[PDB]
């Protein structure tokens, strides 16, 4: 699996959550 743009999503206090925003083979 190779993403392309991990966008830090929202999470606990002062702590974002970068998840995979692209499913590029």
UniProtKB/Swiss-Prot annotation:
Coiled-coil residue windows: none
Disulfide bridge map: 3-20
Top-level taxon of the source organism: Eukaryota
Function: Has opioid antagonist activity. Shows higher degrees of preference for kappa-receptors than for mu-receptors.
Protein's name in the database: Lactoferricin-B
Organism name: Bos taurus (Bovine)
Gene that encodes the chain: LTF
Residues of the full protein shown: 36 to 60 of 708
């Amino acid at each position: 699996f190779k993403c392309r743009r991990w966008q830090w999503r929202m999470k606990k206090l002062g702590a974002p959550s970068i998840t995979c925003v692209r499913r590029a083979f």
